[PDB]
Every structure is written in structure tokens, then in C-alpha cells.
Amino acid sequence: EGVQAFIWQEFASALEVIPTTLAENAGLNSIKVVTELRSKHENGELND
Amino acid sequence: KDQGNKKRQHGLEAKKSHILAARSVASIIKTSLGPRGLDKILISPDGEITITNDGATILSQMELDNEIAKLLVQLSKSQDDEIGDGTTGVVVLASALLDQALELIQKGIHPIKIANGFDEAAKLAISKLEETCDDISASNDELFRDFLLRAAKTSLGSKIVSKDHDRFAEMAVEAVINVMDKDRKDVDFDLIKMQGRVGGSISDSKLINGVILDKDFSHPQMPKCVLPKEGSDGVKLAILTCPFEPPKPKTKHKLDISSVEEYQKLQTYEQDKFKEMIDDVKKAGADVVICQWGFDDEANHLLLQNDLPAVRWVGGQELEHIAISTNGRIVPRFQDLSKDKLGTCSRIYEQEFGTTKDRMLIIEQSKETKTVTCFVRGSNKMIVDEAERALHDSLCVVRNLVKDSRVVYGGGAAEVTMSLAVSEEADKQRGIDQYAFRGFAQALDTIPMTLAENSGLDPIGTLSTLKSKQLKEKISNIGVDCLGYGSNDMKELFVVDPFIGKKQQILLATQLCRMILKIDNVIISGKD
Amino acid sequence: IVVLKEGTDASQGKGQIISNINACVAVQEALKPTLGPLGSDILIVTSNQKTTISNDGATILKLLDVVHPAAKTLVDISRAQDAEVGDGTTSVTILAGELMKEAKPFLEEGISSHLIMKGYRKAVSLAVEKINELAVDITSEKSSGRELLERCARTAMSSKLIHNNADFFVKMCVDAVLSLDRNDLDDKLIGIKKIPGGAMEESLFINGVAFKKTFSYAGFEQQPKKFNNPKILSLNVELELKAEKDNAEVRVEHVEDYQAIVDAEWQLIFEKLRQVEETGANIVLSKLPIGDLATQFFADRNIFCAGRVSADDMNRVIQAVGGSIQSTTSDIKPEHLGTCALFEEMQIGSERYNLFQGCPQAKTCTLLLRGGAEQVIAEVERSLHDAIMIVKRALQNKLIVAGGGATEMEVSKCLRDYSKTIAGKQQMIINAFAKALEVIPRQLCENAGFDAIEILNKLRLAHSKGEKWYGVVFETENIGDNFAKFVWEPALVKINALNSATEATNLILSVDETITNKG
């Protein structure tokens, strides 16, 4: 609750910078890679 | 042609310029959202100066040369002809959706995908809102009437009408009920007309199921009220479209007077002709005579002798309204009057308002009529206009409530619930569409945040508290306490708005966001 | 005093053609967002402060009013294409702009405009030949005159109440427009009516008109119900003894006057009905109900009659019988009589229906649907309307080619193959034209939000092997057989668009050095 929830959401959103940078530098579709990783993580854990 | 000074934009530049224009427009009405909105001083380009917090008027009087902003202005104007109460909310939501679309584009999502995701999110939000609706009519008719009156009073209390808001709400409810079919539940605003005069106070406002005609019954000594004669066949009104003048020869169409002898003889003959006409009128059973033109002095005198009020200078449309209200027919001439064509009204009488010289008359009907006039009084033209706008808002609220018994609670509670549902769906949803759904939920979150900001509450804390209360504790109707309340949970405060109104607001916002998003180039011709 | 050029001079050399190319590319970029059904709209404001938003190519061209002398040629060509053809207006502009872009490096390398024009003409001739080869027109080759349209009709019936029985309804959908004049097809000739009861597969197709039985007066079961070559008489009013419409109030104060009026009315109706016998009409239809006397007279003369025919039903009768409707019975003449090959009364659903069948002059078709519920019949009618529209559009031009860029891909592949066996600059020009031909699918994919690189690579890989019907699928981002999916565009439209684009490109590039006045 309060400002803490907003700051935690912003921190979580910012955490995805590293995978986005890796996808961009690899010549892959930046947005698609993040979605694929998020979808795969729904079944696996620290594997994909 | 007109290549010189011709405006053009690039894709990467236009996609940002449109969003900047949308934000600039949204800043116009951001402060006007909610009952605690701020009054703005506007001067129209035509010189109209007024103070108001209504988003519709603010956008109508405020013109601009930005084509992207003109789209929002036109959308607001078009909505003003439908409900008009969600203009500020619709514009704010559209601006939030456009900002979210800009953020998505910066992340590499094509505009068409963003539009499709926003459409799907709007569909899901509308479905969730409908699922969370409460049916008032199916629960209790007395509670239905109580909620109608409560919403009317809540809408009225934000304007000058607060003095007689109770009577205003009663008049609005009665007007809506009288001009609608219970089963069909379709209400046309054209069936309710707005009228008023400068002077007095709003306490003199009256609801009339007919036409006023703003006439003084010609001669001041004519009867000011005709009764239904203790349960007789109402009051008979003669509808005429010709002046009350004596017949004249067709050779000249004029009467010549040479001296006193001829003057007196012609006057006597004209009096005899007027007596014949009045006898013809009486034989038809008419009590009050209405003519498209004026009356002669002898006609007025003889009608006064016969106690037959005369209405003068009534327009053709006014006569048609009289016929519709009284279910009568228009009689061309006096000699054509018959009992089968005279209109039947409950009563006709003169109503005086202060010292106004109009001395208007009122025609009342007991059965359902297609012409209802809401008369409003006020010490100033601005007061009358504000009262008429409040009446329009109350009529729209009542119309929406009767159209669909399902209702939603205001204060952003519906927006919070829809945002939570859309966020849950986005979390469940896979693919790029998840970002679009999350952006739509964030855009929905703007309305409660703006309401909290306008109400003097910390928006960051308020939005989080509302979301937490509606998510962890239980699903309820908790909104922003814009008005003085002892607690949250509007469900107990009975702050209710029509469900279909909110659905229309969401649909209009989504369509406007798509319209602005789906335009990529703007070309403006030069000037000579 | 008067200066034709307004004191403005122009340079000479490749600079002029390069500037023309730049202007044409600017126009192409301006019109790019509007390509395809999903193309974005453009907000254009006139000098009179009038704002119009639309993706229609013709409207954009009209409101743009290009001032450049060179690009105006392409604008005029596109306007002419729209006026004469009406399809591919934006495609011609896009192709012309792409060709202008491709021509720029050739000009920069010193290639004269004549060589580029000749190469473009040769490539366009090859493309026309390939289009003619790809053009599909099947009459009896692995198909029939109706199967070619029934296949398209079945698509619209997917996931519907008639999906399992689509084989029967597709025939009716095709016949709704094939049996009528193909020069002018419209939705008013495909009226569909509902009859409760019975199975959906038992629906009856009528080449003429059909209507419900509306007679319940004396004389029933006396007039003939079937005819071989009947003559049809159409009337509006003034057929029954007591007119329901356009009548008048009659007041009588004496019994003798009443009897005289009754006798006069009887004589008048007798004469008006004898007119029907004299003209030789077999079926009498009117918008008003028919009384005992008129129906009895018709039965005594072996004449069929039926009243209470609605205005739409009367129009359908007029179209089916090829005759004319008379205002009143007093003017009945044989010139207004129609002819039909069969008249019969149906007993569908235990309810009597009157219809005309087999009339060679019929200009409209009527469908009588059957089913266990009215909602099912309504869904059937909706599916039938969709399929009828699809087959009507297909029949309007039976010469079609695979859509979704498949035709462009095939033309490009063939042009590249020919260029591989052609020496000289002709090879370069043909390759440039073939590459430019791929702009249309590229821009369609871009406007649709698909990944242009991947979709184009997949299309190139698939189209280069096996069938040439592979194209871009817009329902889902992938490559599939458009011909199997019934996605096509007219061959003549493609040929006209290619010719217009080539003409515009040559005209703009035909001049390397020009002295153009300002005005």
C-alpha cells in the first residue's frame, strides 16, 4: 500500500532492462523476447 | 495548391506530436473532473465570457488550431449531444490511453497492435463492469425512485440550483417519465424543451406538459383561467391561422370611410360581423380562441363581453404543438370551427412571474404528451442557463437509469475494479498483448488518481488504498471521497451512476484513442 | 511585362530528373499509410479550413493538389485509373514511386532514360504474359459453372447452422445471381423469405417470386391452382367491391338510393372483372384484399387471384414476370401482362404459398427457407446473404489471380528468371522492376503490423518452390495458399494498375533535361 507499491512496481519494471538489452544487442526482436521469457517462466524456473 | 506554409510531419515526429497535443488538450479539463472541479474563466473567440467547470462548455468555447486537438474537441462535442456528463472523464481516459500507446511505441509495438489490445481491454473491462452491476429496479421500485432522486440531487448540488434542487430533480424525473414508454425505455431529448426568463428565482420553476406560447390573452380584462367545468370534456381550444377581421369584398380587400356617418355605419356592420363570428365560435363549443395573427379592437371587446379569451400571434409550429398536446386539429378559418376539431386540454390559464410583462399562459394536459416544457426562473441570464444545464444533466441521468436498471457506483470505484480485472487478465495473457492490457489498466487507473488530486487528497496514497481495499479485503464499491463524507465505500454513501453511461464513456474513450492513434500524417494547406 | 516563367529559371541535366524522382518519392511516402484495408488515415485541411480524415486514395489525391509539375503526372494517372477502373488507385502510385526509387541509382551511374524505359517496357510485357498465364478462368476443367462459386460460398458458411449442409445452400447462393443478368447484380434481386417448420435442407429456390396465401373469402378451392403458361396481371388497387384503399364515404337516406348504388357498384365491378377475362390474364395480384364477388367471378372464368400483396412483393412480381403494374382495373390491357413457365401452390409447413417458377424473363430470385425455429432461419438467411455477396463479387469478374501478394511474387520470380538469361542493362532494369513489384506486399505487411523482414523472407522461401499461390495471410501472420483460402483479386485490375504505373514512371522519367516555367 501507498508509495511503496508504486516504487516496487517501478523497480520490477526496471529489472527487465538486462534481458531487453541482451535481446537488442543479439539482433532479436526486443519486445518479443521479453514476452517469450515471461511465458516460459510460467512453467519453468531459472531455466530459460 | 497552397504549398507555401503547408504543414507536414514525419512518422517518428507525428507519433510524438499527436501525443503532445493530446496531453495539452487533457490539461484543459484535467482540473474539471469530479464534483470538486475547478471553475475556469473562458472568453470565447466570439466574445462570450463566462465562468464554469463543465468540460463540455470548456471545450466548446475553447478553440484551437491544432488538428489533433480538434479531434478531441469534436469527439467531446458529439458526446455532449448524447449524455454530455462524461466529457471530462472521456477526454482524460483518452489522453491516458494515448500516453500508454506512446510508451508502448517507444518499446517497439506497432500502433495497430496497441489499438487491438486497447479494444480487447475495453471489452474485458466492460464485461467485468456489467458482471459487477447491481440491478436496482429488479430489487425495489421504491429504492429505484430513491436512487433516481438521490443521483439527481447529487448532480444538482454542484451548481447554483442547490437552492431548489429538490423541485428540480422532481421536475426532471416527471419530465423523463411523461415522455417515455415504460416497456420501450427509449427517451428522446427533443420531447423536452427548455424555457425561462430573466428575473425572480429558480423557486418559481414549473413543469408543463404542453406549450406556453408566451401570450397575455390579448385584452388585459379577459379571463385568466378556464376550468374544466367540474369534470366536463376538458377545455376546448380553437386553433386558427387567420386574423380576426371582418369579411371584406375581394375587389379591393379594404374598407373606405368618408365621414362620421359612414364611420358609424361601417363600425356597426363590423360589430355585427364580429358578433356572427363569435356566435360561430361559441356554437363549436370553443372556450379560448387561438389565432396565428392579431385581433381587432371590436373583436377583443366582443370576446370580453362573451368571456372568450383570445390568443394572438401564435406561430405555426406553436399551433402544431398546441394540436399535438390537445390532440386537436388546425382549423383554417373561424367559420370552419367544429367540435370534432377543437383540442381538449385539462385547463388553460395565465401564469404571472414577478413583474414580467410577458404574462405568459400555461396549457396543461393529463394524458401523455409529446411536448414538455421546463420553465426556469432566475435573477440573471447566467443563473437561468446554469439551472437549465443542471436540468439537462438530471434528465440525462434519469434517462440513463430508466434505460438500464443496472447501475454502477461513482468515485472511480468502477474504474478501479476494471483496472484490477484488466491487470489480472494481462498477467494471465501471454504475448505482446499483455503490455497493451497493462497499459489499458494503467490508463483506467488515471480517473481515480485525477479525482483524488482534485479532491485535495494524496493521489498516490489514495489510489493505492482504493486498490488494496478492493483487492485484498473484498470486492466492493470504494471510490474517491470528492464530497464531504464520513468514510469510503461509496456503496454505503449511495454515490451511483448509470452503467450504460460508464460503458459509453469507456467506448468513446477507446474509439477516440484509436482514431488519434490511427492517423499518421497531417497536412494543412496554406493561407492566401 | 508578362513573363511566362515568372522570372524563375531551371537547371539542366540529371538534376531535373533527380528532383522529379524526389518529388515522386515524397508523394509515394505521403500516400503510403493509406495502402490496404488497414491503411492509416491522413488528416488533410483545405484552404477553407475544412478537415477530412480518410484512407481513400482518390480522396487523398484530390485533396493533396500536388504543385510539382512532374508528380502531378502521377497524380493525374492515379485519378484516371480510379475513374476508369476504381481499384488499385493507391497501388499504381506505390508502384510508380518504387520504380522511381529504383531508377535513381541507374541515373546516377549514367544510364540514359531511354534504356530504363525500354527495360521497364520489356519487364511489363513479361509481367503481362505471366499474369495472363496465372489468370484463372474455369468453366468445366475440374469444376463446373456453379462449383467454382460454391467453393467460395462454402467459406462464408463455416461455423454456421448450415456448415454441415453447406453443399445444398451454396447451390442456391450461386443460382441467386448466376441465373439473373450478370451485367447488373444487386442485393435487391436476392430477396430471402422464411417459412417455419421443415428441415433446413428442404429449402426451396424460386427463380421468380413467392408470397403467402392471403385469401379467406367465399370462392375458395374453386379457382385453378396450377397453370402451364399463365399470363400474370399486376394491380395496385380498385379490384374488390368495397375498396379498402383510395375509397370514399357514401351516405344514403333512402332504400331505393341504396339499392341503386349497390347495383351500380355491382355493374362497375362486373365490367372491371370482365376486362380481366378479355385481356386473358390468368393470375391477378393486388395490394388490397379480394371480396367474394371478384373471386367468384374469377373462379367462374378459371382465373386465379390473390390480394394483400405488399409493395415489395409487387416489385418482385414485376421483375419476375417482366411486365408492368396497373394502378386500377379500369386500364387493364394485354400489354402489361407477363408470362411465366409455371405457377403452383406450395404446401410447405401446412401453409399455402403462391409462387412463380421457371420464368425465362425473371430478373430476381426468391428463397423460401425452412427450419424448426425462426432464429435458425434467420441465421441461415444471414449466412446465405454473406455467401451470395461473396459469389456475386466473384461472378462480377471471373478472371481472377491469387491475392495477398502471390501474383506479385510470381511475376517477380519470373522476371528474375528471365533476367538471369538476358545480357546487358536489360538484366539490371528487369531485376529492378521485379524488386519494385514487391513493394505492395511489403507495404501491406507494414501497415498490418507484421514483421516485414520475416514475413517477406518466408514468402520468398515458400513461393520459390512448389505452387505459386503462396501469399501473405492477414488473419494470422504466416504464409499460406491464398487460392485455397479464396483470397484473390481481378487479373484485369492488376494489368491496368501495372500499365498505369509503368506509363506514369516512363512519363516522369522520359525527360532527363527540362526547362519548366513557374506557375
Q: Do B520 and C40 touch (CB under 8 A)?
A: yes
Q: Which residue of B has its CA nearest to C43?
A: B522
Q: Which residue of A has its CA nearest to B470?
A: A1
82-111 in B: which are within 8 Å (CB) of C?
Answer: 110-111
DSSP three-state, residue C97: helix
Are β-strands B225-226 and B347-350 bridged in parallel, bridged antiparallel, or unpaired?
Answer: antiparallel
Q: Considering only CB atoms, which chain B residues are within 8 Å of A35? A: 430-432, 434-435
Residue B526, chain C, CB below 8 Å: the answer is yes
Q: Please report which residue ranges of B404-458 form alpha helices under DSSP H.
A: 413-428, 433-444, 446-454
> Which of B1, B67, B528 lies closest to C45 in CB terms?
B67
Contacts of C132 (CB under 8 A, 6+ apart): C491
Residue B520, chain C, CB below 8 Å: the answer is yes
Residue with cell 496531453: B23
Distance from the Cα of residue C332 to its chain's centroid: 38
Helix, strand, coil abundance in chain B, percent, nearest 5: 50, 15, 35
CA–CA distance, B94 with B464 (Å, rounded to integer) = 22
Q: Which fold has domain C210-395?
A: GroEL (3.50.7)
Instruction: Give me the amino acid identity at C203.
Output: S
Q: Do B525 and C67 touch (CB under 8 A)?
A: no
CA–CA distance, B278 with B244 (Å, rounded to integer) = 10
Q: What is the resolution of this structure in A?
A: 4.6
> Do the beta carbons of residue C361 and residue C321 sit within 8 Å?
yes
Instruction: Give me the amino acid identity at C69.
Output: P
CA–CA distance, B296 with B311 (Å, rounded to integer) = 12
Give the residue among C277, C279, C286, C332 at the shortest CA–CA distance from C305. Answer: C286
Of B31, B57, B87, B373, catalytic: B87
Nearest Cα of chain C lies from the Cα of B170 at a distance, in angstroms, of 43
Nearest Cα of chain C lies from the Cα of B14 at a distance, in angstroms, of 11
- Is B50 assigned a catalytic role? no
The CATH class given to the B1-136+406-527 domain equals mainly alpha
Of B31, B88, B154, B371, catalytic: B88
- Is B87 assigned a catalytic role? yes
Residues in chain C followed by a break, C to N above 2.5 angstroms: none
> Which of C33, C43, C47 lies closest to B2 in CB terms?
C47
Instruction: Give me the amino acid identity at C105.
Output: P
Q: Which CATH code is given to the segment(s) C139-206+396-400?
A: 3.30.260.10
Give the CA distances from residue B401 to residues A37, A47, B87, B207, C136, in Å, rounded to whole numbers and listed in that order: 47, 54, 18, 20, 59
Give the residue among C33, C51, C63, C55 at the shortest CA–CA distance from B70. Answer: C51
Q: Do A3 and B461 touch (CB under 8 A)?
A: yes
Nearest Cα of chain A lies from the Cα of B397 at a distance, in angstroms, of 34
Q: Considering only CB atoms, which chain C residues are within 8 Å of B525? A: 44-47
Name the β-bridge partners of B521.
Answer: C42
Q: Do A3 and B460 touch (CB under 8 A)?
A: yes
Q: Considering only CB atoms, which chain A residues are within 8 Å of B108? A: 29-31
Cβ pairs bridging B and C (under 8 Å): 54
Backbone angles phi, psi at C366, to 5 degrees: -125, 135
Nearest Cα of chain A lies from the Cα of B90 at a distance, in angstroms, of 25
> Do the beta carbons of residue B61 and residue B44 sit within 8 Å?
yes
> Do the beta carbons of residue B479 and residue B410 sit within 8 Å?
yes
Residue B519, chain C, CB below 8 Å: the answer is yes
Cβ pairs bridging A and B (under 8 Å): 34
> Do the beta carbons of residue B84 and residue B399 sit within 8 Å?
no
Cell of B496: 451511483
Instruction: Give me the amino acid identity at B261.
Output: E
Name the β-bridge partners of C111.
Answer: none
CA–CA distance, C149 with C162 (Å, rounded to integer) = 17
Give the residue among C414, C397, C423 at the shortest CA–CA distance from C463. Answer: C414
CA–CA distance, A30 with A28 (Å, rounded to integer) = 6
Substitution target in A35, A37, A43 with the highest count of B β-carbons within 10 Å is: A35
- Chain B residues with CB under 8 Å of a chain A CB are 107-109, 430-432, 434-435, 460-461, 464-465, 467-468
Q: Please report which residue ranges of C223-282 form alpha helices under DSSP H.
A: 255-279
Domain with CATH 3.50.7.10 in chain B: 210-369
Give the CA distances from residue C4 to residues B3, B11, B378, C9, C12, in Å, rounded to whole numbers and listed in that order: 20, 38, 69, 11, 18
Q: What's chain B's Rg over C-alpha atoms?
A: 30
Backbone angles phi, psi at B238, to 5 degrees: -90, 125
DSSP three-state, residue B430: coil
Neighbour tally for B450: CB within 10 Å: 28
Q: What is residue A47's DSSP assignment? A: -
The CATH class given to the B137-209+370-405 domain equals alpha beta
Give the residue among C54, C116, C122 at the shortest CA–CA distance from C89. Answer: C54
Contacts of C237 (CB under 8 A, 6+ apart): C243, C245, C246, C286, C287, C288, C327, C328
Are β-strands C192-196 and C366-371 bridged in parallel, bridged antiparallel, or unpaired?
Answer: parallel
Domain with CATH 3.30.260.10 in chain B: 137-209+370-405
- What ranges make up the beta strands (E) of C144-224? 192-196, 204-206, 210-212
Substitution target in B113, B432, B469 with the highest count of A β-carbons within 10 Å is: B432
Give the residue among B201, B136, B194 at the shortest CA–CA distance from B163. Answer: B201
CA–CA distance, B408 with B86 (Å, rounded to integer) = 14
Nearest Cα of chain C lies from the Cα of B142 at a distance, in angstroms, of 38
Neighbour tally for C125: CB within 10 Å: 11
Q: Considering only CB atoms, which chain C residues are within 8 Å of B520? A: 33, 40-42
Neighbour tally for B254: CB within 10 Å: 7
CA–CA distance, B8 with A7 (Å, rounded to integer) = 40
Q: Considering only CB atoms, which chain B residues are within 8 Å of A30? A: 107-108
Q: Do B108 and A30 touch (CB under 8 A)?
A: yes
> Which of C33, C63, C65 lies closest to B520 in CB terms?
C33
Are β-strands C231-235 and C283-285 bridged in parallel, bridged antiparallel, or unpaired?
Answer: parallel
Cell of B180: 417515455
- Is B528 assigned a catalytic role? no
Q: Which residue of C has its CA nearest to B105?
A: C449
Residue A6, chain B, CB below 8 Å: the answer is yes
Q: Considering only CB atoms, which chain C residues are within 8 Å of B101? A: none
Q: Considering only CB atoms, which chain B residues are within 8 Å of C30? A: 521, 523
Contacts of C418 (CB under 8 A, 6+ apart): C126, C430
- Is B393 assigned a catalytic role? yes
CA–CA distance, C66 with C335 (Å, rounded to integer) = 58
> Which of C42, C67, C449 lies closest to B523 in CB terms?
C42
Q: Considering only CB atoms, which chain B residues are within 8 Å of A31? A: 107-109, 432, 435
CA–CA distance, B349 with B362 (Å, rounded to integer) = 6
Q: Do B460 and A30 touch (CB under 8 A)?
A: no
Neighbour tally for B178: CB within 10 Å: 17
Nearest Cα of chain B lies from the Cα of C51 at a distance, in angstroms, of 8
Cell of C437: 513489384
CA–CA distance, C435 with C415 (Å, rounded to integer) = 9
Substitution target in B17, B523, B527, B528 with the highest count of C β-carbons within 10 Å is: B523
Domain with CATH 1.10.560.10 in chain B: 1-136+406-527
Cell of B18: 499527436
Of B393, B481, B489, B497, catalytic: B393
Which experiment gave this structure? cryo-EM
Residue with cell 389565432: B291
CA–CA distance, C111 with A32 (Å, rounded to integer) = 44
Residue with cell 434528465: B395
Q: Do A31 and B107 touch (CB under 8 A)?
A: yes
Residue B523, chain C, CB below 8 Å: the answer is yes
Residue A30, chain B, CB below 8 Å: the answer is yes
Q: Do C33 and B521 touch (CB under 8 A)?
A: yes
Residue with cell 506554409: B5
Q: Which fold has domain B210-369?
A: GroEL (3.50.7)
Nearest Cα of chain B lies from the Cα of A3 at a distance, in angstroms, of 6
